[PDB]
PDB file of C-alpha atoms in Angstrom:
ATOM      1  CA  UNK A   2     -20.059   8.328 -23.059  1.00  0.00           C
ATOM      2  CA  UNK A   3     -21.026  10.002 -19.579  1.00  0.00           C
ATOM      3  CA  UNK A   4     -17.408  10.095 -18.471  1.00  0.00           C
ATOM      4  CA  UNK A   5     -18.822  11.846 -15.897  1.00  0.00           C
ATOM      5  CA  UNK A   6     -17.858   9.087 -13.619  1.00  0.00           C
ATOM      6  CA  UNK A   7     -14.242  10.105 -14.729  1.00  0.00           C
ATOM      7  CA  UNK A   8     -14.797  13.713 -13.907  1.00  0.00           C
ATOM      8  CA  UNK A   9     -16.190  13.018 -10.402  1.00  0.00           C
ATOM      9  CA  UNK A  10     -13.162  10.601  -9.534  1.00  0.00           C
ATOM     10  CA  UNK A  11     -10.619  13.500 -10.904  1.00  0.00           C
ATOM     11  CA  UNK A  12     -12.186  16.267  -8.923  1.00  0.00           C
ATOM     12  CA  UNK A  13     -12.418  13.590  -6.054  1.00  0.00           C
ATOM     13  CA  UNK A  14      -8.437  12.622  -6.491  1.00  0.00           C
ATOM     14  CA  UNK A  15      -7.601  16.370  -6.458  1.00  0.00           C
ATOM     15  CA  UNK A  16      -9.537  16.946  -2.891  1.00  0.00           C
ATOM     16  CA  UNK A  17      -7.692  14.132  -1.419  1.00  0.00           C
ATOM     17  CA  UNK A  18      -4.542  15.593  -2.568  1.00  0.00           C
ATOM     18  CA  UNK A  19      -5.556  19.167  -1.237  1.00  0.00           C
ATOM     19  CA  UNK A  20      -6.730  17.289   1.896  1.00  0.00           C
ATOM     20  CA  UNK A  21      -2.747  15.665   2.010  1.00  0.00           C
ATOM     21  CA  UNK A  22      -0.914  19.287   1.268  1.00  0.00           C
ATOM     22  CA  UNK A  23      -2.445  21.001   3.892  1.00  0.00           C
ATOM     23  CA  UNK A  24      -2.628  18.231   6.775  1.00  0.00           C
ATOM     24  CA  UNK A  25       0.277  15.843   5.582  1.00  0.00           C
ATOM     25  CA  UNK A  26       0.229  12.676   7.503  1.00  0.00           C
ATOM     26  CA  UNK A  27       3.177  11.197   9.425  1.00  0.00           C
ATOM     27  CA  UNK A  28       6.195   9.301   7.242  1.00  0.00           C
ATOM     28  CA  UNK A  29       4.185   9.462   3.708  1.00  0.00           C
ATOM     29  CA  UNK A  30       4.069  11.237   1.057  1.00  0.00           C
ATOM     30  CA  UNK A  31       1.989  11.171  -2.381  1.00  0.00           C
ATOM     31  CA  UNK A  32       0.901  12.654  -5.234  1.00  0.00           C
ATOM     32  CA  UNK A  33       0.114  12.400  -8.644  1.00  0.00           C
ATOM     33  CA  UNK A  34       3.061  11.942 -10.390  1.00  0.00           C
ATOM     34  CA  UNK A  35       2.730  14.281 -13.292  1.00  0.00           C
ATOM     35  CA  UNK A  36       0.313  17.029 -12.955  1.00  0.00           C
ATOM     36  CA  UNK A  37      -1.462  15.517 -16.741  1.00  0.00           C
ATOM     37  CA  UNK A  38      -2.333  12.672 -14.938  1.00  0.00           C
ATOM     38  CA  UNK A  39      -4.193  12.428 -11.412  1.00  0.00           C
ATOM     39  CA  UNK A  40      -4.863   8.836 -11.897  1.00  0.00           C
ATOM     40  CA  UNK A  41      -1.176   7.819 -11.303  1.00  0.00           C
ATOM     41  CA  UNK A  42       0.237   8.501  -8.200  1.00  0.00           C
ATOM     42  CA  UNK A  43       3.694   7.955  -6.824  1.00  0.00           C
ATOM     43  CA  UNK A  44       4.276   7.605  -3.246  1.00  0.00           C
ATOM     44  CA  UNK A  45       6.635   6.937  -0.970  1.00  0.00           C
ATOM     45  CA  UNK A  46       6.464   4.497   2.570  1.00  0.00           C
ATOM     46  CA  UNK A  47       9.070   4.725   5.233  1.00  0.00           C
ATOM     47  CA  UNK A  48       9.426   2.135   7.141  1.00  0.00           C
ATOM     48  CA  UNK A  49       7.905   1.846  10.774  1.00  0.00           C
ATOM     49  CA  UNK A  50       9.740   2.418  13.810  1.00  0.00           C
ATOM     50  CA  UNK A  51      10.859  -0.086  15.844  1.00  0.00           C
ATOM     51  CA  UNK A  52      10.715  -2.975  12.939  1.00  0.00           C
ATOM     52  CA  UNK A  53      12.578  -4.675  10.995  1.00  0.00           C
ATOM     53  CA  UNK A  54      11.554  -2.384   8.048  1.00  0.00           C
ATOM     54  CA  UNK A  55      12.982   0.754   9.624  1.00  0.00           C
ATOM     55  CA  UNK A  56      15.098   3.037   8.233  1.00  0.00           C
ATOM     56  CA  UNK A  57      13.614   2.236   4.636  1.00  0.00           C
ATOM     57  CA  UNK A  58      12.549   4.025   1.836  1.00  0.00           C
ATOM     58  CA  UNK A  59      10.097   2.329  -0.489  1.00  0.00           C
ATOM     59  CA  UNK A  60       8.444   3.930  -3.484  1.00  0.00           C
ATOM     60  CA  UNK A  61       5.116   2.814  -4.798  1.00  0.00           C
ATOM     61  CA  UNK A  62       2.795   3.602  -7.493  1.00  0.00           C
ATOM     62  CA  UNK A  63      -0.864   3.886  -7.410  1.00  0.00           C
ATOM     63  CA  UNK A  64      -3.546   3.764 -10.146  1.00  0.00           C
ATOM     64  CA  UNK A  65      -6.565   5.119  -9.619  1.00  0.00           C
ATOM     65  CA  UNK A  66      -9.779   3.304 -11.446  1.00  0.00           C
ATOM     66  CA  UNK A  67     -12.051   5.731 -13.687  1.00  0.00           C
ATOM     67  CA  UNK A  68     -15.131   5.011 -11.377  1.00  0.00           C
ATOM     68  CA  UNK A  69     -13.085   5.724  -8.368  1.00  0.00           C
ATOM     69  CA  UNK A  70     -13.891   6.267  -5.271  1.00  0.00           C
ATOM     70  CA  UNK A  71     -15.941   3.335  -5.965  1.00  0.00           C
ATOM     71  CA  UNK A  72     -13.664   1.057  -6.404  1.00  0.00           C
ATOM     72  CA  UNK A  73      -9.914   0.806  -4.732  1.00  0.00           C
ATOM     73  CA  UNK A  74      -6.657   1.824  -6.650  1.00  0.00           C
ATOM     74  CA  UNK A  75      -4.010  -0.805  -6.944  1.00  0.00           C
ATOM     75  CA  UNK A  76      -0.933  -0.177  -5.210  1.00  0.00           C
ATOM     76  CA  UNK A  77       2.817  -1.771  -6.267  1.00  0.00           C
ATOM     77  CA  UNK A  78       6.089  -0.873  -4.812  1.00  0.00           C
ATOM     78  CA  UNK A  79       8.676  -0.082  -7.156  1.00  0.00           C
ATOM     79  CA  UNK A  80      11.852  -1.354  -5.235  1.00  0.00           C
ATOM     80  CA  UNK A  81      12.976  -4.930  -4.135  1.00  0.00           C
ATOM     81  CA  UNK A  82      10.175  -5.658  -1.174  1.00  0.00           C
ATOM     82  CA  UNK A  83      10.147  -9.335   1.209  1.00  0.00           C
ATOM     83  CA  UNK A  84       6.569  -9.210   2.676  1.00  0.00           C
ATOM     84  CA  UNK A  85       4.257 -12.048   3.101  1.00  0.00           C
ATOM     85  CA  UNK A  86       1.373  -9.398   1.591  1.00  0.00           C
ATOM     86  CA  UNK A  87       2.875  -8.560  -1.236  1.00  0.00           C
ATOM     87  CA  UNK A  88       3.656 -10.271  -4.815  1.00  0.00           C
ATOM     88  CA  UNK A  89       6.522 -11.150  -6.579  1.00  0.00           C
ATOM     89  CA  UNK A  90       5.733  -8.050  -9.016  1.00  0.00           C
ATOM     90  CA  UNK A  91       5.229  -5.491  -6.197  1.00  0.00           C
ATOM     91  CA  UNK A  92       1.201  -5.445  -5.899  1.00  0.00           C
ATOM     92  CA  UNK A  93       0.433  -4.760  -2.533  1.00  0.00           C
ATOM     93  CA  UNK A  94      -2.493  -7.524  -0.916  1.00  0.00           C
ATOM     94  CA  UNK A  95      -4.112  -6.216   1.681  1.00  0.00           C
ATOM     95  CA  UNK A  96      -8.309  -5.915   2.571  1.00  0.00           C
ATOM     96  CA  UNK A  97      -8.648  -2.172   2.340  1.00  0.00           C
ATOM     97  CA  UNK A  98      -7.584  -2.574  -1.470  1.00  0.00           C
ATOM     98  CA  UNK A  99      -9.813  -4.857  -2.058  1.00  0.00           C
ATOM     99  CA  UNK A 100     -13.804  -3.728  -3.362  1.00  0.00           C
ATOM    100  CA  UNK A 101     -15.947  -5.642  -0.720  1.00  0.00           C
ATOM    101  CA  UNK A 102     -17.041  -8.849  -0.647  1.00  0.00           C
ATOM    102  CA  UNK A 103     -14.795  -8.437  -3.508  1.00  0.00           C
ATOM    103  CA  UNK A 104     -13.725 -11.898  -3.113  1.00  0.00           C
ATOM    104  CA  UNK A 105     -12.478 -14.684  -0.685  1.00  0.00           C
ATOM    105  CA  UNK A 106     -15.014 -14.942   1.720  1.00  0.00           C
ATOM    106  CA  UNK A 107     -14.522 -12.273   4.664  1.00  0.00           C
ATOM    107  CA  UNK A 108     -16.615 -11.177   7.744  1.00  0.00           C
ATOM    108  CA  UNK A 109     -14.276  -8.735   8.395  1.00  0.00           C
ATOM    109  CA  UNK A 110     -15.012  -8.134   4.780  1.00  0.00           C
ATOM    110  CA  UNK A 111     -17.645  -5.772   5.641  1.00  0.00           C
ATOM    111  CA  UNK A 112     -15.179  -2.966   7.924  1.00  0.00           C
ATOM    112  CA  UNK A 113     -11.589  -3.334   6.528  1.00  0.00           C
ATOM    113  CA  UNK A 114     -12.152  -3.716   2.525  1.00  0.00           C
ATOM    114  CA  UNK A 115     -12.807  -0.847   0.421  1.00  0.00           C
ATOM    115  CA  UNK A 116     -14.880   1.952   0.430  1.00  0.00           C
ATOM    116  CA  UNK A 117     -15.769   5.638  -0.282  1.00  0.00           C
ATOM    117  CA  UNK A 118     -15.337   6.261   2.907  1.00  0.00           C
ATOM    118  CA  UNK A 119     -11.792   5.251   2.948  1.00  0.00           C
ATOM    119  CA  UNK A 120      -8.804   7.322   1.159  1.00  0.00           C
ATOM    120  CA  UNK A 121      -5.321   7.311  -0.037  1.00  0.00           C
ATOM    121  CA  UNK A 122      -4.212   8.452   3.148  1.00  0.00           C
ATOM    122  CA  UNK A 123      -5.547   5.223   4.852  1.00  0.00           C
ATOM    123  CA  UNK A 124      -4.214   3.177   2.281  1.00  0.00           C
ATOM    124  CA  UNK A 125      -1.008   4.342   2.841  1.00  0.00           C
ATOM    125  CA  UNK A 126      -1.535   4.459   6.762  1.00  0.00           C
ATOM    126  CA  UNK A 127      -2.572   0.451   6.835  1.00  0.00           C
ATOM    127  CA  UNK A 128       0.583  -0.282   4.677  1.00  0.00           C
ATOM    128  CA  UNK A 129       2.828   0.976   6.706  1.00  0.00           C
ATOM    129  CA  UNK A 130       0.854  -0.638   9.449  1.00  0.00           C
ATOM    130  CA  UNK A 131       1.291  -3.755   7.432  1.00  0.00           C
ATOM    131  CA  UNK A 132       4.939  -3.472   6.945  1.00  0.00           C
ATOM    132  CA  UNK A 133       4.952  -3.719  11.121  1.00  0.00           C
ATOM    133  CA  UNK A 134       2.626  -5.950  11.468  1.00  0.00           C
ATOM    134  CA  UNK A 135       2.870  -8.933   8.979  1.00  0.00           C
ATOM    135  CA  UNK A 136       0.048 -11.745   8.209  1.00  0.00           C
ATOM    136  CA  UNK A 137       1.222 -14.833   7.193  1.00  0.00           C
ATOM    137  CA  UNK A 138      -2.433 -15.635   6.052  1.00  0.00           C
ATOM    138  CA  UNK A 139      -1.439 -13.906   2.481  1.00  0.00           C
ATOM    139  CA  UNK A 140      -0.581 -15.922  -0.735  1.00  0.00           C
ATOM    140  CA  UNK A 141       0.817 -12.734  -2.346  1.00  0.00           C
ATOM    141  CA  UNK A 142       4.606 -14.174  -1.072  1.00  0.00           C
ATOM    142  CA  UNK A 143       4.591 -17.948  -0.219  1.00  0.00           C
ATOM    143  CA  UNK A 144       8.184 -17.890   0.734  1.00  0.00           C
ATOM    144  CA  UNK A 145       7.957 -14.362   2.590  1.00  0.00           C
ATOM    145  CA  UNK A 146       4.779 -16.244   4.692  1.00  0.00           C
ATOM    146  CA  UNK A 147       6.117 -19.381   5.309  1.00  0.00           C
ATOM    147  CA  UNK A 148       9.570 -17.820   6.970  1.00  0.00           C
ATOM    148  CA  UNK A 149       7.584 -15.234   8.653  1.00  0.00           C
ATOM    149  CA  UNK A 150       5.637 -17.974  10.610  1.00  0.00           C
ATOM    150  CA  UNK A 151       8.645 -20.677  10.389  1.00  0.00           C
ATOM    151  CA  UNK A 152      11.854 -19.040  10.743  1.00  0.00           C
ATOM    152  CA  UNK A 153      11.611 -15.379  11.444  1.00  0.00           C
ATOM    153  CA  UNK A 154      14.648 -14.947  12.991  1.00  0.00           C
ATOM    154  CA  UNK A 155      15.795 -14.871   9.036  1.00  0.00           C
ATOM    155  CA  UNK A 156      13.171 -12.751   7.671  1.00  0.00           C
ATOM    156  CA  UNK A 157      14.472  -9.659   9.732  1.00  0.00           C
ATOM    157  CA  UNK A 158      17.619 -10.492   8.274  1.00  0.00           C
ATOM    158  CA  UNK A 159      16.071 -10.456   4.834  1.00  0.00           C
ATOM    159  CA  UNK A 160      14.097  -7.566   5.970  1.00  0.00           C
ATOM    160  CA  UNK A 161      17.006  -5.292   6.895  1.00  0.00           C
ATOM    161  CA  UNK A 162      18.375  -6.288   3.226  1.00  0.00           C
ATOM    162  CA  UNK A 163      15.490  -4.746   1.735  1.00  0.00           C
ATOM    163  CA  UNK A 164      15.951  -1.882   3.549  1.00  0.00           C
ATOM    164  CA  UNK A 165      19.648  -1.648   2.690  1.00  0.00           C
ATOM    165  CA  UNK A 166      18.885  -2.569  -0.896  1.00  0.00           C
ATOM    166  CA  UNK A 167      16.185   0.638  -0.958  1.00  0.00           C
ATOM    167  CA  UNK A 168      18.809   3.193   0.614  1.00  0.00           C
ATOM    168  CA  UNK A 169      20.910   1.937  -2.161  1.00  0.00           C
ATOM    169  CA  UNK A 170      23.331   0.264  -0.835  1.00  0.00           C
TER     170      UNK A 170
END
């Protein structure tokens, strides 16, 4: 078949990473992780500023969907993480991964979800955002959400853990 689609999201994966080399953003950095394949990407998120995520270092891998930019890549960290937004397995839950409308009902829906508008570099940029800012209105972590809004005095205890635990120590 066509897999012209494929091409177009290849060629369209290698401008974004031009884009990224020449006007690298602030605390990230990506890129495919093996030359053979542009579709996975390995990244890595430091933590915000003035959080309780600072001073860590987590790694992440994204895969890119043949039809892409159409649709989102899915993003998982690779190290221990303790966010409401993400799941036990590392996928990261947040609206600009998700295609629009995609699903649970969302007015916002139409600005903050997925787009071809939007790139990696956004991704990244609203998940460190998202580290910073948590939403207890996430699923992903049940525990993570109900101690965010309940007792958060221990989740930046938890949180500094993480960090610890990602320095490797």
């Amino acid at each position: 078949g066509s897999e012209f689609m494929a091409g177009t999201a290849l060629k369209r994966l290698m401008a974004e990473y031009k884009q990224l080399t020449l006007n690298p953003p602030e605390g990230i950095v990506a890129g495919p992780m093996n030359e053979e394949n542009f579709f996975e990407w390995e990244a890595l998120i430091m933590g915000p500023e003035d959080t309780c995520f600072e001073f860590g270092v987590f790694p992440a891998i994204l895969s890119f969907p043949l039809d892409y930019p159409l649709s989102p890549p899915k993003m998982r960290f690779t190290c221990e993480m303790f966010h409401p937004n993400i799941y036990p397995d590392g996928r990261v839950c947040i609206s600009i991964l998700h295609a629009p409308g995609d699903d649970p009902m969302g007015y916002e829906s139409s600005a903050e979800r997925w787009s071809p508008v939007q790139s990696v570099e956004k991704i990244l940029l609203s998940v460190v955002s998202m580290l910073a800012e948590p939403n207890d209105e996430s699923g992903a972590n049940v525990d993570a959400s109900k101690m965010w809004r309940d007792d958060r005095e221990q989740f930046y205890k938890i949180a500094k853990q993480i960090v610890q635990k990602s320095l490797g120590l």
